[PDB]
Design a binder for these strands. Structure first.
Ligand SMILES: Cc1cn([C@H]2C[C@H](O)[C@@H](COP(=O)(O)NP(=O)(O)OP(=O)(O)O)O2)c(=O)[nH]c1=O
Ligand SMILES: [Mg+2]
Ligand SMILES: [Mg+2]
Length: 430
DNA sequence: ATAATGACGCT
DNA sequence: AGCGTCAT
């Protein structure tokens, strides 16, 4: 009983920017603020693919992956901003630079793990200990958690949203043990007070709003973070897991959203995270392998161990472009030209990277897709990266792939190429 | 005819 | 090393 390791040793947060690219455009262009807007890339085919949607536009049914002309059918006052284009391709530099803004602020409170362009995990265990010594042993106010939700509360014996939020918050605080510094519920509560402050600083200093989740691990933090977007944070406690998971679709836990989670549903014949507790670990390892079974056995009990790695900077810098339909690259003049375009954006980013973060890449990864191939990558070969020069890299990339050209003649390329990819990896201090 | 990325796992 | 999974 006492000998069951309950996974409450750490405080972990996930901070995720709300409709990030839309917010980045709305700061630049006031005209777009507090209106239905989407961010699109490439206007030509159907008015553009949408990649980010404001919450106002979401309310009409606009989703990412949508064509902008379909979007205008559900939402005719939709406003659009389009991604920058350079050298024939979408260029995400604005949002990368806006991301650095936000990660840098986050870094002041705690070590962060950049998880994507718009979210980072936080390990607040140490900071919580400090704020807990500072706090003598005094109660925690609800004024210190003005945007926090407590998952599972309220329960027991106001019908409008903000009032409901405070009721759960006061229920949570009315049952706190504020004299016990190793009480994991107190620890979470304190973590969420820091995340209120970290989130105020972000919006104070950037104009960007975010949501967040505060729990004991990365899966729960991520999952908590999406229960009350936008502009809100959510505390998932160890004790709230069994109710939460009893109706939680398996596909919603991170890394179960694909073929693994579909096979858990299909082999086990279940639907919800909580039905995994029935199985023994050995059982789950026979169905799903040694690491997954172990991982699943703890995860359904709300235990996960993957640590917040100290890594604020990407490990790979890549540029890619699809050539869909009858835009597939069929001449070798054509393949060279786009390999050079890509290599010029890669060169400029690598030079900025070196001056920014004092490191040089040593390996260039080339990848193409051919037309009619059913995989998303047909080939991927490495080669040495010794100079940050676009023509050398694109020359090197071409020779690494030139023998994929099966066309009978010299100047053609067959079958036509549907994707090109250049990535810099293997960084070393400079 | 989503598209542009970026991390991590398997052999 | 090259490929595959899952994510955002
Ligand atoms: C999911 C996803 C997002 N993005 C770009 C713009 C998104 O704003 C940036 C951050 O992703 P996110 O947090 O999953 N989506 P969001 O920030 O727009 O919306 P939310 O407020 O977090 O729900 O993702 C893509 O470019 N491809 C994607 O598949
Ligand atoms: Mg976001
Ligand atoms: Mg995100």
């Amino acid at each position: 009983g006492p000998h069951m390791a309950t996974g409450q040793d750490r405080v972990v947060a996930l901070v995720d920017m709300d409709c990030f690219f839309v917010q980045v455009e709305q700061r630049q262009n006031p005209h777009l603020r507090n209106k239905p807007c989407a961010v699109v890339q490439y206007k030509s085919w159907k008015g553009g693919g949408i990649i980010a949607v404001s919450y106002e536009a979401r309310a009409f049914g606009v989703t990412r992956s949508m064509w902008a002309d379909d979007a205008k059918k559900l939402c005719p006052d939709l406003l659009l901003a389009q991604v920058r284009e350079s050298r024939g391709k979408a260029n995400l530099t604005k949002y990368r630079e806006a991301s650095v803004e936000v990660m840098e602020i986050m870094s002041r409170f705690a070590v962060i793990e950049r998880a994507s362009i718009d979210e980072a995990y936080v390990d607040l265990t140490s900071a919580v200990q400090e704020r807990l010594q500072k706090l003598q042993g005094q109660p925690i106010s609800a004024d210190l958690l003005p945007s926090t939700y407590i998952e599972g509360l309220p329960q027991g014996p106001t019908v409008q949203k903000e009032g409901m939020r405070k009721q759960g918050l006061f229920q949570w605080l009315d049952s706190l043990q504020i004299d016990n510094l190793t009480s994991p519920d107190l620890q979470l509560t304190v973590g969420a007070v820091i995340v209120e402050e970290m989130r105020a600083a972000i919006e104070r200093e950037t104009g960007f709003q975010c949501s967040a989740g505060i729990s004991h691990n990365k899966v729960l933090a991520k999952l908590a973070c999406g229960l009350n977007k936008p502009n809100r944070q959510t505390l998932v406690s160890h004790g709230s897991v069994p109710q939460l998971f009893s109706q939680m679709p398996i596909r919603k836990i991170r890394s179960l959203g694909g073929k693994l989670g579909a096979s858990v549903i299909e082999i086990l014949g279940i639907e919800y995270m909580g039905e995994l507790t029935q199985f023994t670990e050995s059982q789950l390892q026979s169905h799903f392998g040694e690491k997954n079974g172990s991982w699943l056995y703890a995860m359904c009990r709300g235990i996960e161990h993957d640590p917040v790695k100290p890594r604020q900077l990407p490990k790979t810098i890549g540029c890619s472009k699809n050539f869909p339909g009858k835009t597939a690259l069929a001449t070798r003049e054509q393949v060279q030209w786009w390999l050079l375009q890509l290599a010029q954006e890669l060169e400029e980013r690598l030079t900025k990277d070196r001056n920014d973060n004092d490191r040089v890449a040593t390996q260039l990864v080339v990848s193409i897709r051919v037309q009619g191939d059913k995989r998303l990558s047909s080939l991927r070969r490495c080669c040495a990266l010794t100079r940050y020069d676009a023509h050398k890299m694109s020359h090197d990339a071409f020779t690494v792939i030139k023998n994929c050209n099966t066309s009978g003649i010299q100047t053609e390329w067959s079958p036509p190429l549907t994707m090109l990819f250049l990535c810099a990896t293997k960084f070393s201090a400079s």
